Amino acid sequence: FAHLQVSDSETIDLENLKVYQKVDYSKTAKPLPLYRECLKPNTEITFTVS
RNA sequence: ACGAGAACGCAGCACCAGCUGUCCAACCUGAAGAAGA
């Protein structure tokens, strides 16, 4: 990884953001108080790795 | 009633002229703002 060379992401539209709540899997889907800002699905992101 | 008396070893003269404290050298290497149930 000392020779792996990854870059930062490119321009991302502000419209592609959303707020989601954590969901569980233990015997049910229990809502959680933690809400976080997330990019919506189906969003293109550009990188550059060498 | 002295081989003695008198007599500045003194006068003018820049330790001064030329000369980069310079040349070469990444503040660099590795690291998920992330996870219970």
**CA-to-CA separations, A26 to A7, A39, A43, A47, in angstroms, rounded:** 37, 25, 29, 36
**b/e map of A16-34 (b: 16 or more CB within 10 Å)?**
eeeeeeeeeeeeeeeeeee
Quickly give A2 CA vs B25 C1' distance in Å: 22
Q: What is the spatial distance between Cα A39 and Cα A20, in angstroms, rounded to a whole number?
A: 9
Strands annotated E in chain A? 17-21, 35-39
Q: State the structure-solving technique.
A: cryo-EM
A1, closest nucleotide (Cα–C1'): B30
Cα–Cα distance for residue pair A23/A13, rounded to 1 Å:
26
Residues 16-45 of A with CB under 7 A from strand B: 22, 24, 26, 32
Characterise A48 by phi-psi region: left (phi > 0), alpha (psi -120 to 50), beta (else).
beta
- CA contacts within 13 A on the Cβ side of A48: 4
Extract the tokens encoding A14: 């502000």
Identify the CA nearest to A34 among candidates A24, A26, A25.
Answer: A24
